[model samples]
Target: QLHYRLRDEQQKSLVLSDPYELKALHLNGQNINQQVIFSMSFVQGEPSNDKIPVALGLKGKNLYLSCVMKDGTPTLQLESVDPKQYPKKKMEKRFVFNKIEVKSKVEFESAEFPNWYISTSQAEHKPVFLGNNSGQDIIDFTMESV
Candidate 1:
């Protein structure tokens, strides 16, 4: 009840990877759809800054969202080893997401891959990956904070 939950413009909730795949749920309030609680820690920069750099943490699981290169193209990946494992001077550069707020919502652009934002697929149950969809529907995640 008191955690940060994200919902995209199309109303899909950004959830942790299930055994099936990494995807957002349709959010009908079932057990799986109820939402896995999340925690956000600002890695660098301040609230007044245009880009709020943050390290998004998955409660209980200890996985952090990361942006890494895959087959030459940058994609969003989950890193089980959090930023705390690395030196504060730098963890893996892929872990820092420059969060930009839009209205009340926000989008996460990774430090490793500039311009690529955290986004979901148009089709339901599809994987929630990173892409170059700025100012689009799926990119902006309206964060519901505790």
Candidate 2:
């Protein structure tokens, strides 16, 4: 797997885009094929002016990739590895929300395999929770991905 970073002209920083492509004998429409997983955009400055393929399937060969914005904001991109690559419990993560604040508690539900969950609010502030979690009651406020 390979990783890349995308920056703005002002260098203020924004979202990172990950491309899911593999070295090919003829990828320029000669002998290779591809599929897309998902695109992750952060609240950096501006959205990237290109498409970053998150996943690809080249003539039955599959790949996974992701990007994230680590500028102190809430931006998380997750990907499932090749099933053939790892044969464990399919690799899953969740939260058992615990109450931390008196006024707010967080909740999360679970999703199916190879699921992609996102927070509608990019704020990532206290008393906020979203995405597929295990209905764990949480406190004072924190959104973390383990």
Task: Give the lDDT of residue 125 in candidate 1.
Answer: 73
- TM-scores, all candidates, are 0.80, 0.20
True-structure RMSD for candidate 2? 17.2
Residue-pair clashes per candidate, as listed?
Answer: 0, 14
lDDT of 2: 0.25
Give a tens-digit lDDT track for model 2, residues 68-97.
Answer: 334643333334556675322222322111
Q: In terms of TM-score, which candidate is strongest? A: 1
